[PDB]
Write a protein that binds this DNA or RNA. Structure first.
Ligand SMILES: [Mg+2]
Ligand SMILES: [Mg+2]
Lengths: 539, 144, 144, 134, 134, 48
RNA sequence: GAGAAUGUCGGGGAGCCGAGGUUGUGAAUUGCUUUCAAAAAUUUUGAAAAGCAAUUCACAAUAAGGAUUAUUCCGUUGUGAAAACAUUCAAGGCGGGGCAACUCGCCUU
DNA sequence: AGACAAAACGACGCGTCGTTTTGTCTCGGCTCCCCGACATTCTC
């Protein structure tokens, strides 16, 4: 049931954890009994999950013999950050993590033409990732990725109950009593024994071969039930009862547009490019009104009086347009209007040139012009013409709503030029960007995804017009964001690129191929058996 | 970590409440139209273009009527000429100006309604105005 | 004096005054109620439509066709109560949260629905201020 | 390099069971995402309604699924009628077959697959017909 | 003022002389350049080739002549399958007729003319079926 | 130009393609010595 | 570890209302620009229209839309292919409360 | 040879992908349900 926990965040986390556990059960053990011998749990406010998920998951790994009784199964072994960090340092997970993340740091070094982002060492005789102190506000080398989560999960899983007991109750009161665990788990007390000989190499191989699955919310329309009180004639008597609404009525599950509403204006003294219009909105006349912004005020006489005043104050809007300055202007409007009388001014209609759409078509709604809301450009169409060139478009939420209401596909399957649609992209999608030499037209065969193949996987982040921005799927946070002062950043000003990060710097949208993964990050592609089942399920 | 309306459900609830208040104000207005039309208080120009049969009390589609501006051959005229004249008489007695907005007559009528006879249309306008501006009120009461 | 006449006076003395949102933003509902009352009683002696009980019953029936009980209730009132206490200043009470009250873990009831299945209705928990829970609690304290 | 088109026969053998070998070879032929005409889908619908008496809803669901995923529809060329009449003078085929070859040819297809229509016969020295089940 | 379309019925009653009055109606239905669906032309070809057993050459000549001079072919719409499936939940016609109506609607047609489609009826508040022979 | 006219007429097709690359339906073809009517600025000749 | 009882600190959900703001209509006043449009010495004054406005008032809308005439609503939430749900949901009886509608308890399936 | 094909051509406007920069609805009251955490006491 919804709203059964502290807050939506932990509820979503727990629900997705359950879903992922079910998926792994089906994929790796076919849902049979006691397929999970043991489960280890860790969190790393959030403590609300440490006990609820353990209690819920006790139902799978519990033993009915009567030995395992209590609030939680004895097989569930929560840990602590001490064990995970000590194992990571001892077993070399930290070293492989730095080797995995370092190329981002060399890219930052090259982009800033310095050497301060990599530090050489001689105890390891290699370069370690690093950041300058003035870019070290809250930088963390683990946090800037997504697969660290999986790395933590791995280092937790191999940690047995003996390890957590040893590292939580190290106080022995006698060396001999705990010396058995010392000899069994640690090499001689210096370093712990690996779970197996090839642990580090296998962990490297997996970590460099993980694709991250991103949950998507493409809800545009859904069905809504309307119950309303009404007097109904039954058995010759009128009774008040609830009635369900007749006909069809959809509920939009996204904010259709932005709150601010503007009105259309036509100004002879400005040139309007085709496909764009001028919209004017009222705004307070305040200290941020300089010559360029004063020239963006729709009234010409207000512009005349206002520039006269600004000249009178030595061209300083801060002194001119303080509340005291505005009052002085209002009291003495004659000595800036060439001596002509005029009403006071506190708010003015500033105009902007761009693409704003009508909110509706009834009454006076046809005069309200709004802008698309945040996070509502959800579909990005990629088409091809018979010759071979790719065309791009972004369909607004209005056409998505109308198309989905008429039972059609969200994106038109052909553009106005007749170009056939490759496919549509949404935020959190995954695409493969092939090399410049590869010719991916009927590739498929997505079973042999190696490190080079997986490193060329990009996730959509946002779209606008014909532009689509991508981030490598393994990137969570940038090493350094963008600031208008230094004008530097990991992925330039937008913190996301329309091209690859690698040296070729190729348009991602011109060669990318959309892919589909499941909750477990396993690629999904057409196969014979699948083709058979398409219409076996109809057979 | 600190907590500031961190739920999309709360935002949906806020929009729902705003909408609900809006339609309840509209419903009040509709019922006022129905009652005043029964009482024969609305003027012919206004009342001719509210639906009273299928859409009970709602305006006819693609129409924005004003109770006070009668539209004849594309021109707009004010209907309470005499109360407007009395209000301008009051201002000139106070000696301020002789040129004021027509829609200032409502407050003159509201003062006049306390102790004088006003025509019915003004009274309907006043009731609709009161429906617009209701005022703060605590449901419990509990005088302290 | 009434808030409408006060606003009219302030507009008389300072014709550049901003009323909406500047002069009066929010005031107790008692002012609007009292002003609209005084207006309606004063206009009542002069307009005969406010005395015709035929018209009053017509408004009653139109507004509450399917609720004869409410018609019977309002057949005793007049236009004053119908305008203020019914239409304009009608504020609904809070929806009942009784349905959201928790249930005891012990007492159950079983019944068979129209589907032929047998399902259980819960029993709502006791309010704490109930004297009987008072007895339970303080006997528990006596033993403790 | 070649543009593979297909006919109603490949889909019909794919759907049916009693011809396990034919159904198999049909399903591998569908793996290469072969192009299809709008005609071929139309006779697919017709034969599903006549031969197989399937209800309309399931038929439309299946055709939408296949057009989305497995087969790639091709646009109905506007010169299909004149070009179909062109092959009429030189070729001895049913007029529906002449239309399917006309639209396959006008869409730059090089190889067509089917049991019927004169295996191994090149049409206007630009399109070939291959029986793949053999 | 309204994009009027037609179906195979108008063409078929135009073709025959057995009923002079219906033939006439049909021919004055064609004088106004009524729009037409490609599926209508396909069904017309099918009925000429099947019922009437006419030669391929002359029916192809007639089709080309009519499309060049008489009726305006409408480009086949890519959303015809999904839209026809959508109309399928609320309506119960032969699926061929549902595709005809779907393609007529998707091309912005206002009035459709036919016989066996329950004249006067409104299809998704966009297009109405009219029997003109009455 | 005359080239694609040549192979179009050789393939039995019409001289001019009946739709352009954008998919716009062909109104008609003009040749030297053809005749057209140019309607007035107010006339609306759509199905005259 | 569980249950119950008493206090402290938080979070979530639902509900009854209020005041602005914005866009548009109408009006009162005053402006900038352009054109008509005359007078006068390319320039200045005058009548009209349009475009953009500013101060004040009345009004229309305030997610596009769809119900319904109950003093009722659904539309920014979650699940997921069923475009299907969840977030109201049985029957009685024995009672308390009001001008009553309606509201609040107890008992048996 | 003369008259078609097409390249200049002087125009402005446009548009250029690449990139950065700019903008983005707001506060007021109150009621009433549920859960969570940490405090104390008693019992299994
Ligand atoms: Mg065939
Ligand atoms: Mg038919």
């Amino acid at each position: 049931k919804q709203h059964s926990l502290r807050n939506p965040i932990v509820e979503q986390v727990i629900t997705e954890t359950l879903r992922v556990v079910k998926d792994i059960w089906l994929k790796y053990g076919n849902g049979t009994k006691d397929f999970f011998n043991e489960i280890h749990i860790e969190l790393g406010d959030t403590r609300y999950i440490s006990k609820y998920i353990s209690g819920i998951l006790s139902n799978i790994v519990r033993v009915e013999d009567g030995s395992d009784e209590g609030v939680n199964s004895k097989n569930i072994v929560p840990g602590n950050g001490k064990i995970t960090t000590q194992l990571k340092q001892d077993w070399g997970l930290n070293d492989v993590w730095n080797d995995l993340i370092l190329p981002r740091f060399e890219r930052m070094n090259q982009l800033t033409n310095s050497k301060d982002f990599t530090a050489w060492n001689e105890n390891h005789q290699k370069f370690l990732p690093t950041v300058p102190i003035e870019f070290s506000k809250g930088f963390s080398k683990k946090r800037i990725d997504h697969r660290h989560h999986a790395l933590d999960a791995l280092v937790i899983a191999c940690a047995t109950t003996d390890h957590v007991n040893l590292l939580n109750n190290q106080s022995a009161k006698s060396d001999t009593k705990r010396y058995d665990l010392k000899k069994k788990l640690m090499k001689f007390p210096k370093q712990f024994l690996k779970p197996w000989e090839k642990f580090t190499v296998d962990a490297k191989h997996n970590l460099e071969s993980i694709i991250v699955s991103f949950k998507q919310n493409l809800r545009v329309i859904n069905k809504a039930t309307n119950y309303y009180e009404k007097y109904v004639e039954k058995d010759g008597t009128k009774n008040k009862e609830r009635v369900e609404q007749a006909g069809t009525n959809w509920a939009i599950r996204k904010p259709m547009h932005k709150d601010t509403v503007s009105g259309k204006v036509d100004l002879p003294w400005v040139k309007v490019p085709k496909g764009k219009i001028l919209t004017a909105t009222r705004k307070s006349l305040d200290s941020s009104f300089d010559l360029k912004s004063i020239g963006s005020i729709t009234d010409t006489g207000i512009q005349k009086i206002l520039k006269n005043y600004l000249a009178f104050k030595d061209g300083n809007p801060e002194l001119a347009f303080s509340p005291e300055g505005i009052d002085d202007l209002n009291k003495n409007i004659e000595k800036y209007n060439d001596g002509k009388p005029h009403q006071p001014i506190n708010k003015v209609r500033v105009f902007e040139l761009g693409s704003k759409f009508q909110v509706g078509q009834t009454g006076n709604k046809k005069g309200k012009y709004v802008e698309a809301a945040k996070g509502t450009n959800l579909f990005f169409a990629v088409y091809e013409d018979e010759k071979g060139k790719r065309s791009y478009e972004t369909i607004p939420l209005n056409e998505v709503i109308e198309r989905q209401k008429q039972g059609l596909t969200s994106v038109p399957l052909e553009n106005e030029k007749g170009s056939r649609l490759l496919f549509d992209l949404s935020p959190n999608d995954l695409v493969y960007v092939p090399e410049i030499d590869e010719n991916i037209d009927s590739n498929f065969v997505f079973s042999n995804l190696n490190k080079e193949k997986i490193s060329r996987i990009y996730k959509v982040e946002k779209t606008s017009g014909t532009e689509c921005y991508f981030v490598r799927q393994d990137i969570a946070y940038l090493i350094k964001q963008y600031d208008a002062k230094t004008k530097i950043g990991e992925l330039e000003s937008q913190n996301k690129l329309q091209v690859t990060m690698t040296d070729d710097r190729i348009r991602i949208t011109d060669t990318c191929v959309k892919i589909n993964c499941d909750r477990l990050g396993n690629i999904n592609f057409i196969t014979k058996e699948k083709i058979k089942q398409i219409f076996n399920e109809f057979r | 970590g600190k907590g500031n309306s961190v739920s999309q459900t709360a935002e949906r609830t806020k929009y729902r409440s705003v909408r609900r208040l809006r339609e309840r104000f509209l419903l009040r207005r509709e019922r006022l139209h129905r009652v005043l039309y029964i009482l024969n208080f609305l003027p012919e120009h206004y009342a001719s273009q509210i639906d009273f049969e299928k859409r009970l009390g709602k305006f006819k589609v693609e129409t924005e009527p004003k109770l006070v501006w009668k539209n004849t051959d594309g021109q707009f005229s004010f209907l309470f000429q005499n109360s407007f004249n009395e209000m301008l008489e009051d201002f000139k007695a106070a000696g301020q100006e002789l040129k004021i907005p027509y829609d200032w007559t409502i407050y003159h009528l509201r003062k006049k309604a306390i102790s004088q006879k006003i025509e019915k249309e003004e009274l309907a306008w006043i009731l609709l105005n009161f429906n617009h501006k209701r005022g703060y009120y605590q449901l419990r009461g509990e005088d302290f | 004096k009434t808030v409408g006449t006060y606003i009219y006076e302030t507009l008389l003395q300072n014709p550049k005054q901003k009323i909406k949102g500047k002069l009066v933003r929010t005031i107790e509902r008692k002012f609007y109620k009292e002003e609209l009352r005084q207006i309606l009683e004063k206009q009542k002696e002069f307009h005969q439509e406010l005395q015709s009980d035929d018209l009053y019953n017509d408004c009653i029936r139109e507004l509450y066709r399917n609720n004869e009980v409410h018609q019977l209730t309002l057949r005793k009132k007049d236009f004053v109560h119908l305008f203020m206490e019914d239409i304009i200043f009608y504020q609904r009470p809070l929806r009942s949260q009784k349905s959201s009250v928790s249930n005891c873990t012990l007492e159950f009831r079983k019944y068979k629905g129209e589907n032929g299945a047998e399902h259980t209705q819960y029993l709502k928990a006791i309010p704490k201020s109930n004297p009987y829970y008072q007895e339970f609690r303080l006997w528990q304290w006596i033993f403790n | 390099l070649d543009k593979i088109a297909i006919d109603t026969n490949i889909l019909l053998y794919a759907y049916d069971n009693r011809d396990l070998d034919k159904q198999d070879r049909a399903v591998e032929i569908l793996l290469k995402k072969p192009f299809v005409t709008q005609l071929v889908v139309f006779e697919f619908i017709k034969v599903l309604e006549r031969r197989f008496k399937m209800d309309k809803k399931e038929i439309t669901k299946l055709t939408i699924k296949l057009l989305k995923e497995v087969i790639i529809p091709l646009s109905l060329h506007r010169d299909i009628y004149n070009y179909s009449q062109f092959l009429l003078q030189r070729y001895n085929f049913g007029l529906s077959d002449i239309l399917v070859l006309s639209d396959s040819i006008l869409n730059n297809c090089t190889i067509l697959l089917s049991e019927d229509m004169c295996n191994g016969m090149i049409v206007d020295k630009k399109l070939k017909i291959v029986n793949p089940f053999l």
